[PDB]
C-alpha cells in the first residue's frame with residue numbers, strides 16, 4: 001500500500017538473547033546472551049522487540065518476512081505495556097498481535113486467544129494500523145493480501161509501537177530472522 005512506513009528496531013527494547021542487523025531491519029535469537037545497560041524499556045522475560053517509531057495518529061502499513069520460521073509474533077502495542085517479567089500476550093495487556101508456534105498453529109492475541117484457519121502459510125505478513133479507526137489488521141501477502149485477522153474497536157489512548165519476536169529456536173528451526181521488507 002501507499003501508507004507504507006520505514007521501521008527500525010529500537011535496541012533499547014530488545015531482549016538480551018536477540019541479535020540485530022546493524023541497519024535495524026533484521027532480528028534473530030542468539031544461542032548466548034548480551035551484557036548491556038539497565039533500561040526501564042528492555043524486555044527481560046521473552047525474546048520481544050519494538051520499533052523506534054511512535055504513532056499518535058494517521059494510518060501506517062509495513063511488511064515482515066518469515067520464510068522458514070516455525071514460530072514468530074508480529075503486531076502493535078501501547079508504550080504503556082510493562083517491559084519487566086512474565087505476562088500473558090493479549091489485547092488485555094496492550095498488544096494487538098497474531099503469532100505462530102509449532103510450525104502450523106497460527107492464532108490471534110485475543111483474550112483469550114483465537115485459533116486462525118489459513119488457506120496459505122504466509123511467507124511475508126503485512127501489518128496495517130488506523131489509530132483514529134481503533135483498527136489494526138494483518139494481511140497475508142503470499143495469498144494476494146488476504147486478511148489473516150483484524151482487531152477492531154481497540155482503545156487507542158496513548159502512543160503505539162511496532163511489536164516483534166522471532167520466537168524460540170528449541171526445535172532447531174527458528175534460526176531465520178524476522179526481516180522487515182523494503183516495499
Ligand SMILES: CNC(=O)[C@H](Cc1ccncc1)NC(=O)[C@@H]1C[C@@H](C2CCCCC2)CN1C(=O)C[C@H](N)c1ccco1
Pocket residue numbers: 046047048072073086087088089090099100101165167168
Ligand atoms: C497462557 N499463554 C500462552 O500460552 C501464550 C502462548 C503463546 C505462544 C507463542 N506466542 C505467543 C503466545 N504465551 C503468552 O501469552 C506469553 C508470551 C509468550 C512468549 C512471547 C512471544 C515469543 C516467545 C513466547 C510466552 N508467554 C508466557 O510464557 C506467559 C506465561 N505462561 C504467563 C501466564 C501468566 C503470566 O505469565
